[PDB]
Symmetry: D3
Subunit: 226 residues, 6 copies
Amino acid sequence: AMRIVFDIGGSVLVPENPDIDFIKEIAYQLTKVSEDHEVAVVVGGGKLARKYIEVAEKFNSSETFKDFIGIQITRANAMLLIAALREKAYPVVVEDFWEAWKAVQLKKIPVMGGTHPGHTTDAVAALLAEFLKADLLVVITNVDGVYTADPKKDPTAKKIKKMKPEELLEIVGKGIEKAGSSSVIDPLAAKIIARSGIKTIVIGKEDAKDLFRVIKGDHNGTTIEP
Amino acid sequence: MRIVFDIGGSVLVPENPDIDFIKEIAYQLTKVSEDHEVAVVVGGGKLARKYIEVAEKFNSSETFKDFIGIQITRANAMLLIAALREKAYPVVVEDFWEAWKAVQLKKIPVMGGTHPGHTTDAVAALLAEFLKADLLVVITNVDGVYTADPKKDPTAKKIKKMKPEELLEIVGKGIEKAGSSSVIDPLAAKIIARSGIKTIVIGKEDAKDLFRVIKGDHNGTTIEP
Amino acid sequence: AMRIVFDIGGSVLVPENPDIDFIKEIAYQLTKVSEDHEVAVVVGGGKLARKYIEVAEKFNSSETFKDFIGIQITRANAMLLIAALREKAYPVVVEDFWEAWKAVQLKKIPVMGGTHPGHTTDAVAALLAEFLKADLLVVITNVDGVYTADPKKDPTAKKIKKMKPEELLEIVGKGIEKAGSSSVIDPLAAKIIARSGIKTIVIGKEDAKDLFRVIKGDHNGTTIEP
Amino acid sequence: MRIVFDIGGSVLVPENPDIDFIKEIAYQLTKVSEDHEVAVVVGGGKLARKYIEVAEKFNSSETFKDFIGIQITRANAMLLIAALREKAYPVVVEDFWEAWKAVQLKKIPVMGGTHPGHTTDAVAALLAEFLKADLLVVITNVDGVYTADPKKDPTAKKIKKMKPEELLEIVGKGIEKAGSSSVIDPLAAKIIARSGIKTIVIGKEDAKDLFRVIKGDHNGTTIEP
Amino acid sequence: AMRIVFDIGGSVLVPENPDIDFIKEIAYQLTKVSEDHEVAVVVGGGKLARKYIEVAEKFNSSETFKDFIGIQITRANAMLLIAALREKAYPVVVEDFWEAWKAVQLKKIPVMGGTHPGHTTDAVAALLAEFLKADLLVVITNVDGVYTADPKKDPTAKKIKKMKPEELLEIVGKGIEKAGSSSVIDPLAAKIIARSGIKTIVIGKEDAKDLFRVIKGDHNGTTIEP
Amino acid sequence: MRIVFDIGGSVLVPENPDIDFIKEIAYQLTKVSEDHEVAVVVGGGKLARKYIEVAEKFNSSETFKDFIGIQITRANAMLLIAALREKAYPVVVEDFWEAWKAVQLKKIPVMGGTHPGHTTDAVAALLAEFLKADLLVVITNVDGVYTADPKKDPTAKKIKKMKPEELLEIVGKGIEKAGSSSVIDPLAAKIIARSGIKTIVIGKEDAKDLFRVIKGDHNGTTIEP
Ligand SMILES: Nc1ncnc2c1ncn2[C@@H]1O[C@H](COP(=O)(O)OP(=O)(O)NP(=O)(O)O)[C@@H](O)[C@H]1O
Ligand SMILES: Nc1ncnc2c1ncn2[C@@H]1O[C@H](COP(=O)(O)OP(=O)(O)NP(=O)(O)O)[C@@H](O)[C@H]1O
Ligand SMILES: Nc1ncnc2c1ncn2[C@@H]1O[C@H](COP(=O)(O)OP(=O)(O)NP(=O)(O)O)[C@@H](O)[C@H]1O
Ligand SMILES: Nc1ncnc2c1ncn2[C@@H]1O[C@H](COP(=O)(O)OP(=O)(O)NP(=O)(O)O)[C@@H](O)[C@H]1O
Ligand SMILES: Nc1ncnc2c1ncn2[C@@H]1O[C@H](COP(=O)(O)OP(=O)(O)NP(=O)(O)O)[C@@H](O)[C@H]1O
Ligand SMILES: Nc1ncnc2c1ncn2[C@@H]1O[C@H](COP(=O)(O)OP(=O)(O)NP(=O)(O)O)[C@@H](O)[C@H]1O
Ligand SMILES: O=c1ccn([C@@H]2O[C@H](COP(=O)(O)O)[C@@H](O)[C@H]2O)c(=O)[nH]1
Ligand SMILES: O=c1ccn([C@@H]2O[C@H](COP(=O)(O)O)[C@@H](O)[C@H]2O)c(=O)[nH]1
Ligand SMILES: O=c1ccn([C@@H]2O[C@H](COP(=O)(O)O)[C@@H](O)[C@H]2O)c(=O)[nH]1
Ligand SMILES: O=c1ccn([C@@H]2O[C@H](COP(=O)(O)O)[C@@H](O)[C@H]2O)c(=O)[nH]1
Ligand SMILES: O=c1ccn([C@@H]2O[C@H](COP(=O)(O)O)[C@@H](O)[C@H]2O)c(=O)[nH]1
Ligand SMILES: O=c1ccn([C@@H]2O[C@H](COP(=O)(O)O)[C@@H](O)[C@H]2O)c(=O)[nH]1
Ligand SMILES: [Mg+2]
Ligand SMILES: [Mg+2]
Ligand SMILES: [Mg+2]
Ligand SMILES: [Mg+2]
Ligand SMILES: [Mg+2]
Ligand SMILES: [Mg+2]
Ligand SMILES: [Mg+2]
Ligand SMILES: [Mg+2]
Ligand SMILES: [Mg+2]
Ligand SMILES: [Mg+2]
Ligand SMILES: [Mg+2]
Ligand SMILES: [Mg+2]
């Protein structure tokens, strides 16, 4: 009954290597969810992308060129999902929004990676959600939600349950994102979510193992909403 | 030296195209490219906002509104290309590597927008970053960066020199929406900050003599690490 | 029951600025007409295109380059229609005929602008009609029909009701069209219409406010037909 | 000087490719590019009409028939590219800006068709217009423009010099259909007229010495404002 | 009930010139076969391609460039089929597999020619069959089947009825294919057919005049199968 | 001289990228391009096989597995491009004519894969053939071509010199599947044979001094008609 965009982190799909079972599992659920909803997906780069970006840095590449290498990896990861989605997926990695649109019209799941430098795949997901006028944006990261601070660094981090887009920006928004930089949601994405008021859900791997219920409201993550 | 110029659409096209300015700026750019490598990106201006407003009355997404804006920036870019005559890359550049090619051919590439979510300011910063340019010159409607909006606030004072971090405080928090204005868009500010791109912000008057501006002789703002 | 191509003049959609209500109105009718017919559209450049072409002339650009600037504006205008067509339109501006074809297959209205230098959007519309083997080509200009001469210049201009393609060429056909030049139908278009015998209707803004009836034969314009 | 050559497919491929001519014309072009900037567009010829006739038996639209013709012109263009060896742009040029690039690289770009509705004659005129070429040389099956069809009418007389307006009277009225022939297609005639492109029409014999032709030494027709 | 890829030789469609009736006939049957099956096609270059490649050789072009000229001709031939297929065909010549896929989704017959140098249209057909996970690959050549040797050269040539992919490679597989070179199935194609076990049928023009039955198993050609 | 280098992904990326090697090979290439025209193609390596294996667990066709492999080869190509800094074409080359352009700009083009059905070895051979290169240098995990697999067979002997026909016997029969390895893939072997491309096969040690390798001073294999 609705349109949903999924932003799956590269480190979730590829922790250090591919998590075969998670991919097979996540691909199965997206397929099921697409049985009654319009589904579009964006995959991240993760550990592997940072390794290639670190190499380029050793050669002093510009931050723009590293972004491109990062983009190249995200597309590689995206192809692993497309593979696991079998015939329900759009064969090739989508590179622009209009094409994602066509895939949806053909009732096939479009899987895309990065687009242009200056941001992360989160921003791609947000803009996609916005372009398709999606009803839900599901961000699957390697943290169970959005906290008061970095849950892996701070001990007093509070896992916010609900919040406004303006509140999400306060958390991030002021971050100077370098090629390889990581966050729950990149500053640009936050601004896009706030900009047009995109209902957004942030969840971890554990909760991501039950998407069908997650998109029903039953999950233990954060819910950014106007 | 490698220099990237970010010319505001409102400066190039106030209401209708500003022939005289386009013309004078074309001569400056031509003069500068004689001893320097020049690349250029142009904005949307009044025309971009007008078409974006129409799309708004039809409830278009912000993403589609951005695309329309990008289309307008490319049309404006073509007017500058016309002005530069034989010193310009004949077509609107849409990728950074193509700009690189243009430069390899001793030609001036003129870009318009690229993708949604930001403005041409970001395109010019990314381009400067990409080409490892020595300098980014931003030509806009104000003569520099002020402590506040010079056209609104009476207490606004011009900041002659600052660091990316400071420029960031003056901006970076505004959520850029289709057609939104800013002395420098947030994203562009973060790009400049992340790479430490030497940036100069000047107005139309200073633009009349880019040869002096690139030497630090201007009344605008200089931003550098 | 049929396939129709609409050639809407840029000066009709954008007299000096956008005519919001006409666009909203025209977009609504095309949507309705597409409920039972296959619809494809081409939009012109109008006043705005001539302003940009005039600027380039001051810099002595070649007629080819001005054509390109003209093309750039037509695509901008086309996006305003796509905007007003909402979800019934193909998201991006179509640039070639094969793509217009796909849009039609997806049962979405393809809106295109110019293609290559040397002509006007009229020629694009005619070739489109021809490519899709359309049954009707509807040219909406800022004149109520094809006259014996320019209705805005000559006082003895006769508003022909019907005519043959060979007759339309006599009117135009011998025109040397420069970048920015305007006419009821450019010489090339005329030749295409005559070439394959495309049933063509030319109408003004007033009549264009009732397309549904116009495509039924009830209108006060001209009807070029084999 | 900047020169654009419009070589008829029927001259290049009469029935089968004309090896000797392709070969000799390649040498002339190579010789000319030594001191001039050279760009080239090739037509479809006998082969184009043959494939177009087949599509006709299947009731294809004139537009699709044009596309097929364009495909043939590009194949022919590749034979000339082969002939020019290292002096040519390695691939068939399809845009005018790419032709421009080729020229910037001191390479000879060879184009085939572009879009439906006209022929390669128009492509060469638009290209000449685009590059602001000094001269457009049309090599065809006749040795010049005559008052009438030289291969049909006994009274046809060769016109040594004329203006675009006159060339226009001799053509411009014919409704160009897929594969239609003409000493110069109407659209091309209007392009030449609108920009005042100095044009020279010559046959195969004169083609053997392009170095003399570009100096005005030929038995063909010269068209200029 | 199945997906079929047809590899039609250029010399079969264009012996020396186009065989109008064979094309009209072959186009009609493919249309009928597509009524109940998913059909995709690849056309060859034939005599004409070799003529252009021979010309380039006289100018000493590299084998790669000749491959490109060969490719250009195959696309020309492909357009003749598209023409004969009328509205049941995808309008433009397909150049990559993903696009062939879309055409099939739109339930239109995708007709493609060559892709990249180094091989023949046979290899394109095999890889296509493989990409679409086709159930049958039908190779229509100008010989009634795969023989022990060249039926036009050797007098003791045995027309094998059935065989394994590994057996087909023994026949070919070791061939050094130059631009313009011809064979029942190019070495690369053979390897692709063997690689993923593609059920393949090789037939001549005569048998090709009854595709519907051919795809049923009733034909007098060869049947390469795992 | 015109030289094409075919650097194995496993040499460039054994497990993780081999910084030191990438770095050293970048210097060699830079040194060589000083007096020669250089073009490069990089393979997939360990990473390509890893992603291809994952796709295999999902029953992907061999064609899709090839595409994934091509994507990995392009990522690796970008690491080399980074290493070559200003001497390289800024983006991954995907067509042979673009490689040609890069060379026209005195820049080093680095390609990854192109189409399915073969490996990067074939891409480099076709590229060498295309550019009419004087030499094809294949850098891999072994130090030359042996009578048998040097890492398996104890009797394997290194062949110092041979003809395409002989190289063909040692390979050419293996049915290349997604991610399959070979000192030289069959298709590449047939390309080398059909045009008679002078080819040199060397290992990582010799790669450290490409200036000597291109002169015939190496411990690898030389293949030529
Ligand atoms: N307030 C916060 N709440 C939750 N996570 C936070 C917060 N602040 C910082 N983080 C960090 O965000 C990380 C999350 O996202 P990130 O590493 O960027 O992965 P990803 O986006 O899922 N993957 P990919 O697309 O491949 O980069 C955590 O593991 C934290 O280190
Ligand atoms: N602190 C400040 N310093 C200078 N200008 C400011 C400041 N704060 C706000 N502004 C505004 O910034 C405007 C500047 O830029 P902007 O309108 O976005 O034009 P542009 O970027 O030159 N054009 P274009 O590319 O077509 O949008 C001024 O005219 C002010 O209204
Ligand atoms: N015989 C005629 N009948 C009707 N109009 C004529 C005739 N002869 C000349 N004209 C002119 O044609 C004009 C019409 O078309 P034109 O100005 O080119 O607008 P358009 O094609 O609708 N717009 P666009 O696509 O943006 O250029 C009129 O307003 C007349 O000045
Ligand atoms: N007045 C004329 N002067 C010269 N030729 C004429 C004239 N009128 C008609 N023609 C015809 O023009 C033909 C010329 O051009 P055409 O057959 O179209 O060849 P092409 O343009 O050289 N080839 P291609 O690009 O492959 O079509 C002659 O052979 C005549 O039959
Ligand atoms: N063992 C064999 N069995 C059958 N044909 C064979 C065999 N060995 C060699 N051939 C040759 O294969 C030829 C067949 O294919 P070929 O000439 O390449 O045409 P094609 O592939 O149908 N056309 P195209 O795609 O345009 O090249 C025959 O006419 C024989 O000369
Ligand atoms: N006769 C032979 N001579 C040399 N190597 C051989 C021979 N036969 C088999 N091999 C194998 O060839 C391997 C060589 O190449 P390969 O593993 O495919 O790496 P690569 O091509 O350098 N890398 P990439 O482009 O990423 O695949 C060796 O390590 C051997 O296991
Ligand atoms: O649209 C995109 C997607 C990715 N990246 C580059 O790829 C990295 C990996 O992406 P992700 O995993 O962080 O989303 C980013 O940090 C970044 O430098 C971009 O520049 N733009
Ligand atoms: O890379 C770009 C350039 C422009 N725009 C759209 O064009 C407008 C006009 O650009 P500018 O004048 O603001 O730079 C922007 O505000 C915006 O919506 C983009 O989305 N992305
Ligand atoms: O396919 C096209 C469409 C438009 N134009 C240029 O755009 C102008 C505006 O188009 P229109 O409004 O006249 O159709 C034309 O006069 C002309 O120079 C072209 O060259 N080719
Ligand atoms: O820019 C072009 C070039 C060629 N053709 C098609 O190719 C034919 C062969 O071209 P030529 O030999 O007539 O120039 C034309 O008659 C025609 O149908 C076009 O449509 N447009
Ligand atoms: O994907 C392709 C298709 C065709 N060709 C060139 O076209 C010729 C004609 O193709 P075909 O008729 O042999 O299939 C081939 O022999 C060859 O040199 C290629 O290089 N690659
Ligand atoms: O032109 C190419 C290059 C690479 N690959 C895929 O990438 C793999 C990795 O390439 P390489 O390391 O084997 O050269 C190949 O085995 C294969 O499946 C291709 O299909 N075609
Ligand atoms: Mg992410
Ligand atoms: Mg994230
Ligand atoms: Mg700007
Ligand atoms: Mg700004
Ligand atoms: Mg119009
Ligand atoms: Mg009109
Ligand atoms: Mg011609
Ligand atoms: Mg002609
Ligand atoms: Mg074949
Ligand atoms: Mg065959
Ligand atoms: Mg390799
Ligand atoms: Mg190998």
